[PDB]
Amino acid sequence: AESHWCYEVQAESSNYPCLVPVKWGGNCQKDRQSPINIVTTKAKVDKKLGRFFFSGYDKKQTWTVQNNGHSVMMLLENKASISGGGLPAPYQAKQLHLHWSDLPYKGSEHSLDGEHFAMEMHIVHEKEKGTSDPEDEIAVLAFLVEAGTQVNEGFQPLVEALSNIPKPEMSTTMAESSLLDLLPKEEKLRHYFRYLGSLTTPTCDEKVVWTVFREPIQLHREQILAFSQKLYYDKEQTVSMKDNVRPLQQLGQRTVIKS
Ligand SMILES: CCOc1ccc2nc(S(N)(=O)=O)sc2c1
Numbered sequence: 001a002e003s004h005w006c007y008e009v010q011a012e013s014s015n016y017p018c019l020v021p022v023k024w025g026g027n028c029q030k031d032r033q034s035p036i037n038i039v040t041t042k043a044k045v046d047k048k049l050g051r052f053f054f055s056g057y058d059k060k061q062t063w064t065v066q067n068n069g070h071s072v073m074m075l076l077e078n079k080a081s082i083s084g085g086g087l088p089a090p091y092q093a094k095q096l097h098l099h100w101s102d103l104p105y106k107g108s109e110h111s112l113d114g115e116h117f118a119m120e121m122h123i124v125h126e127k128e129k130g131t132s133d134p135e136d137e138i139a140v141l142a143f144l145v146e147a148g149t150q151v152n153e154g155f156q157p158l159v160e161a162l163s164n165i166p167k168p169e170m171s172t173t174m175a176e177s178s179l180l181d182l183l184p185k186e187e188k189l190r191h192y193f194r195y196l197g198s199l200t201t202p203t204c205d206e207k208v209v210w211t212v213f214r215e216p217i218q219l220h221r222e223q224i225l226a227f228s229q230k231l232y233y234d235k236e237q238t239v240s241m242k243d244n245v246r247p248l249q250q251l252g253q254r255t256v257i258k259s
């Protein structure tokens with residue numbers, strides 16, 4: 001650890017040295033890493049991957065949201081959970097965050113058939129374990145975001161909050177909203193891809209069971225641009241927050257499955 005981990009854009013936009021992704025420490029150099037490209041036609045249908053059950057997702061809350069220096073993060077604090085989805089237990093929701101760029105064809109961490117989307121949103125959950133860490137301790141639900149002309153009203157509380165947290169270490173409270181406000185219609189979340197991998201920022205622990213839903217969130221171009229326009233990586237506000245994206249990792253001998 002010769003310097004703090006960063007994304008490539010930060011290294012390229014500032015003279016202050018930092019460890020770019022290919023140099024990350026932790027478990028970040030192991031072989032069951034994320035994100036990946038998904039060849040959709042090569043992922044086999046597994047019949048055990050049934051629908052999700054979301055709890056606390058429809059409930060209107062006033063969430064705390066913060067700039068942690070690499071993303072914007074909603075604190076979910078077990079106020080929501082999931083089950084089904086071929087998952088082996090209920091998982092409690094801890095936090096939601098995003099990765100993005102400022103061009104529509106990049107911004108997502110995962111790619112589907114070699115296409116990146118404009119953002120990727122991650123909802124991070126923790127396994128409810130029995131008595132005797134595992135490869136599926138954490139369940140991250142990934143939603144791809146497609147750029148368009150449709151104003152997503154569901155996202156407005158979040159997007160408005162961004163102006164209040166431009167620098168790292170800053171928190172604000174969002175206007176009343178639910179998690180379902182931010183997602184596609186529930187009936188469109190029956191199609192998803194599933195594989196085992198890692199966390200995409202250090203320490204990149206190989207303990208994530210990934211879900212990438214097929215159906216994108218639609219967000220207006222300028223609601224997407226609001227992220228890079230209002231947020232910074234640093235207190236000095238020299239680097240606008242964008243391209244907070246880990247490059248693609250090799251699948252190796254892992255298999256990807258779908259519903
Ligand atoms: C302090 C909590 O620790 C971490 C560390 C890395 C990390 N990556 C993700 S992501 N990008 O969803 O795969 S959630 C997460 C949480």
Ligand SMILES: [Zn+2]
Nearest residue numbers: 097099122200
């Ligand atoms: Zn993430």
